[PDB]
Symmetry: C4
Subunit: 173 residues, 4 copies
């Protein structure tokens, strides 16, 4: 632990990849030209509690979709960078816009495009379903899988390492 | 006998939706539609609980036509949507049905479900559920949510009430 | 173990439950009131093969749906019985219509309403995902699960029992 | 795990089955006549990397749908054959239309229609969800299942055999 917690303690921004992280990775099409994407419910409460404890939420995704716009809005995710292959540059751009540093950003991804941003963020996360190279470069690997609570699990970890986890639990107790 | 005694006197069984009746997936498409999946074997269990005289209810923080439909075809008379404070709703039910909290079962999977699982006469959770709800529950299912969790529990309550073998005999 | 083949060798009618057998048990709804159901692709080739060796196929379900009609018609399943509580009566009513005895009927099912039909058919089949009572009265239980190959495997098993499997494989070699 | 690298060394075309390879083999229908098919995100980045290494791509499937077109175009798959059960016929047709030896063709599939093309290609591949006959005929079985990164797995494998794996990764480091 130790190193993980200090990295997580100084986080002001959590920035997410969509496919493989917020969803399990299925790109779903149908015979009328419609697209579908699945998200996990427990991820929703975790993100909410990070917003309310003071952390700014962001999405950086290489694909563009309405489903992502619809989920981000309802979740209180504030910055939505769609159609962006270069994750680092978007993350650096938010850092200058919000007036923080890479060291104050947490980043979670699952594939090669995320690699630099996971490497250069203060706290870089990946998932079991994530590829070999991106996992080698991360400060933490989740126990749960993309679209099955990987985000929630890291939400609770940042909350713990900020001694904010009990405030959150107690509102339901 | 710990679990069987708590369940022996259930007069109403009430349920969370997402994570319980579904595997907790929330599905959206590019034309503004939402989708939810349920498990067939749950329906049979729930219907069997109905027939023995147990009242059924749903209490969920989200809101959808899918939940109305499933509940209608399953004889679920109390459908409470857009409601995150599960314990107030359940107590609201308890009183207006003329029953007690000790005669209530409630199954749930996340923190909004905590207090209701704690205060319900028979509190239930699931493997996929979080640790704080689970620590507070009288029983945990082997099968996951949207995978027989509810059916398992339905069978549990019937056995407790001397009603399982007779339900089985209807299909023999 | 080998009592299994004598049962399988005189099958002229293979009748299937739908949910838990042709599907994994997911009943799917949406906000426009639509319903959806998933089928396994490999089950097709196996029902195609049983139909070719001269076996007549049937579906008995306590549930409606045009999805059943669509899948059934693409596999050439002639007899489709939907909205049926009592499967055993449906099955028997179907044997009288044909020149068939219960002994020449195979039937596969996952839950209690399938119990009598699985028990009285000459070759009753169930699945790892079926309830306990239905499994304890079947003559065979599949390795693969509903909507994941249960049907294909039992299709292969009957073909082997009727000396039609080896000829069937060969056509793809 | 050594015979595989030489077989793959000379591949100038990777051709693919759809159902059971690019998807998990679910065939999805709803009550408005709409068919749905699911794909895997990490496969795309695998395919475009191959295509960028100078390898032509192809699909050969027994079914027909708008989804396969939408996905194939999206991933730069130029040769798309639909409504064809003779996979070995179609592939040969492609090999001679493009002027390439069959020893240079890699082909992946899950079931019996695929078995001849798998066996006769310079690099035939199957997956764990696939049948026994087609598995026993393949040069390589994937660890990852159809619709869950099987295509991505082989994609990287071909790159490693061709000495383009390192250059592919560098672009994200
Ligand atoms: Mg991703
Ligand atoms: Mg829930
Ligand atoms: Mg069934
Ligand atoms: Mg196939």
């Amino acid at each position: 632990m130790n190193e993980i917690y200090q990295k997580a303690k100084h986080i002001k921004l959590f920035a997410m990849d969509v496919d493989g992280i917020l969803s399990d990775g299925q790109i779903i099409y149908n015979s009328e030209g419609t697209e579908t994407k699945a998200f996990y419910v427990q991820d929703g409460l975790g993100l909410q509690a990070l917003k309310q404890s003071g952390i700014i939420l962001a999405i950086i995704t290489g694909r563009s979709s309405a489903m992502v716009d619809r989920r981000a809005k309802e979740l209180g995710i504030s910055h939505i960078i769609q159609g962006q292959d270069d994750k680092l540059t978007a993350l650096v751009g938010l850092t200058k816009k919000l007036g923080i540093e890479l060291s104050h950003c947490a980043y979670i991804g699952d594939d090669l495009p995320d690699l630099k941003a996971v490497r250069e963020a203060g706290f870089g996360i990946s998932v079991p379903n994530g590829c070999e190279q991106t996992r080698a470069v991360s400060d933490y690997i989740t126990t749960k899988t993309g679209g099955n609570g990987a985000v929630r699990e890291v939400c609770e970890l940042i909350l713990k390492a900020q001694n904010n986890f009990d405030a959150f639990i107690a509102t339901f107790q």
